[PDB]
Amino acid sequence: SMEQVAMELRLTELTRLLRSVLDQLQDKDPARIFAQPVSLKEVPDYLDHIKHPMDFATMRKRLEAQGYKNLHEFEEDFDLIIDNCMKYNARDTVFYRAAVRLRDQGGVVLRQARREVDSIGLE
């Protein structure tokens, strides 16, 4: 149907916008602390602590499968990256501090993204 094609165009468009957001958020992690999943070879007990791991590479896979239906779903995953880190690592670590900085600097990008999604009407 034409409707299904229209839908897929918007989803494709949403994906295009979120790819830009994802690149902007990742730039706020210059140390690449959040670029890849936490290594279960290096941190063998990680899943005893964190039940829903997330990282930028995994977000990117889902993004390219057009697996984010709306901005809220994308934001949930971003929040998992930060929130997992701020629980696993103590306040006086480079890891916790990197998450705080990513949270604070990312809020700007995400505030804008929410306005653009609403405005251009991508869902």
Ligand X SMILES: CC(=O)N1CCN(c2ccc(C#N)cn2)CC1
Q: Which amino acid, one-letter code, is at 104?
A: D
Instruction: Provide the token pair at 70.
Output: 């709306």
Instruction: Provide the token pair at 69.
Output: 């239906």
Which positions from 87 to 106 touch Na ion by CB under 5 A, shown as an x/- string? x-------------------
Which positions from 82 to 121 touch ligand X by CB under 6 A, shown as an x/- string? ---x--xx-----x--------------------------
Q: Which amino acid, one-letter code, is at 50?
A: I
Q: Nearest-5° angle of CA 8, CA 13, CA 18?
A: 125
Please state the closest distance from residue 78 (CB atom) to ligand X, in A. Answer: 14
Tell me which of Na ion, ligand X, none is bound by residue 43, counting a contact when its beta carbon lies within the kind-specific cut-off of 5 to 8 angstroms: ligand X
DSSP string across 31-65: T-TTSSPPPTTTSTTHHHH-SS---HHHHHHHHHT
Pick from 25, 98, 27, 95: which is nearest to 63 by CA?
25
CB of 87 or CB of 114, closer to Na ion:
87
What residues from 58 to 87 belong to the interface with Na ion (CB under 5 A)? 87
If one asks whether residue 80 binds ligand X (CB under 6 A), the answer comes out as no
What residues from 14 to 33 belong to the interface with ligand X (CB under 6 A)? 33
Please state the closest distance from residue 89 (CB atom) to Na ion, in A. Answer: 7
**Residue 48: CA atoms inside 13 Å, Cβ hemisphere, count?**
3
Applying CB under 6 A, which residues contact ligand X?
A: 33, 38, 42-43, 85, 88-89, 95
Q: Which residues bind Na ion (CB under 5 A)?
A: 87
